[PDB]
Amino acid sequence: KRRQTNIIGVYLADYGGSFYGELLEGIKKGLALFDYEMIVCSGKKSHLFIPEKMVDGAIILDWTFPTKEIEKFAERGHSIVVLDRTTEHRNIRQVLLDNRGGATQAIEQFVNVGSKKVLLLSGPEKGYDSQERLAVSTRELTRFGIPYEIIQGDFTEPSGYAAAKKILSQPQTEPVDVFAFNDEMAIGVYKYVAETNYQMGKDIRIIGFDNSELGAFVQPRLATIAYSKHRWGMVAAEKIIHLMRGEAAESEHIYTRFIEGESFPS
Template structure:
């Protein structure tokens, strides 16, 4: 692979002259610059990005760190981030896994957007102390080089549970997310606060992991226990859809024996019949705003923490709970 030294030798100039020409500096005449660029092209020269970034102290690349890429949630979020960077000259690279963390200290990226529990808060604060700019979507973190763009998880959970209680339910099941998830913890905390104000409510948690299969398993458990109409709040739509699909194989009807609410309003939830109730917010706006905030941090501008607001999107069948003619548990599921 050709180096700057090879170009300098072929052109009969110094290494610094080649460097100036490759970086478009006015310190080199147009004629010399054109000759150097032609030689570089002839030798198939590829710039060393790491060395160039270290010298310029910028890469023009933003890193977004995600726990994984599964499910329907991430597409709109990433599209919003990309749109937020469109006119800035920055590119976006999506990363996952602990090995990718080194992109920050090695200055291969100019800043990070983090929605990834594999980062500890202590690790992120350490990078911030080193001057790295970070926007977090999944934790409450205070530092001059860190900005928070958080989803209003508690408000969404309150909307969901209060609506289910208004329907007259005496039994509430909550299917939780992964233990390490900030969003799951926030939603669950709000659920418990609402439930505590209603001592008549029979409340039960079922452990989930934000994936469809755990929703289906939770549905199986609920059907086996069901003796009266019940409310179910799945802490994301993926699990709600998994439960929904399982319930279609039983005699339990969503919207009658069970009122089911998810969280995220992913596209797939709109195609369920009856339509799935869910907590809605703009994932694209969340992504766009996180990019905008990070660009401001990088530019040295003052930024305030932001919050993404949510609304309740009711399903097609969200009338009062019915108990008349309620089936016994033994015949609620197909054999």
Template sequence: MVSIKDIAKQAGVSISTVSYALNGSDKVTDETSARILQIAKELNYVPNASARNLKKRETKILGVFLTDFRGDVYGDLLHGMKEISNALGYDLVVCSGKQSHKMLPERMIDGAVVLDQAFESEELLQYADFGHKIVVLDRELDHPNINQVLLDNKAGATLAIDYLRDKGHRKIHVVTGPEGSYDSTQRMKGVRLTAEHAGVEIIEIPGDFLKSGGVQAAERLMREYREPVAVFCLNDEMAIGFYNRLSDSQFRIGEHFHLIGFDNIEVSGYLQPRLATIEYSKRRWGELASQQLVKLITGEEVENERVYVKLIEGHSVGRA
């Protein structure tokens, strides 16, 4: 690979003179600059991006860190991030896994959007202390270099429990998310608080935010079935697993099992009967994340943002 040393040798000038010419500095004459640029062209010189980025301390790239890439939520989320990032002059790189965390301290990216349980909060706070800009979607952290764009999980859980209660259900089984999940924890806080105020009994069933969690919950509840059962799956993926397991049984959604989910992913609208669920704009969530991160990077004032939710009614829930 051709370096500026090669250009300097052929032009008979110093390395610093070549650097000035390549960067358009007025410290070299127009004649010398033109000659150096011509030699660089003839040698097919390609600037070293890593060195340039280190000097400028910017890459115009934003990093997005996800726990994994499964699930229908990520598509719209990333699309929203990409549209805003590109409009603001930035590209996106999407990562998962511990090794990718090095991209932030090594300044391979200008900032990070984090929706990744593998990122410890202490690690993020340490990076923020060193001046790195971060937007978190899955935790609450108080630091001037960290901004929060969070779902209103508690409000969504309240809407779900109230909907089942208004249909006459007084005992509700809740299929939870994976241990350590911020969204699952916050949704369960909303569930417990609402149930306590409404006089509703809550029975928790461990879940995993995957279809398999819904299948396992359905198998358990079918074995225990004595009367119509109300079920709140903390995401639609598990609700779909629940549907799938009941599809080859004598039980019917909306009659034997009254089911509501959370996320309103696209396939939920095609389920029969239509799945009741909690909706929010995944695309808007992504847009806000990119907007807030660029504001942090450019030194603009930012405040934490919240993504609001609403209830989507469906015939998957009938009267008790």
């Protein structure tokens, strides 16, 4: 009520730096049209100090930012767009990835190639994006009679590295088939395989998610699920303006496509 700073706080988790740059650019461009600016905050304790007397509204992409804290910030008059979870609270809207369509498109490729086992390298289990990706992956693998193992990660590259070390210790099937829930965990897998006799694409077949630009230039090209990161940010920016101006700001999804790569010969 008493303040309009024309600043949106953007709360990131700092795994997703493989898509953050182009997401942030889209947020920036969308906000500039309405003379708004953005500050970006990241860290485990970043939700403890929200400058609520200095920020008009928030765009949240951080699974460690607790939902109860989001609701409390919404009830004090601040508008919020979540990019990482679903909500029913007033003053909050959603701009989410189509995780169900993305995971279906990736897991379809393992089916179409006749996979004998699929290893599901997931992110945080309390995180919505991984939950949706898991619910659809496991359902389709069951449907087609394909066994799976779920390996816990945290969306960061170190967890993908540790996963690959855990995977390639135990005896696996002839090719090792991996669905990494993001490109960063997949790059972590590349890192460890570079320290082994294993050949990427041949001995270990991988599909990621996010379409990081590093994945496009790595050897061989990381097969992945792509979406427009610029538009994700643009739509989030327009949604936060419309929402705080009392207007119609319906929750939306960002749709995906599979991009083929020699890391998964299909």
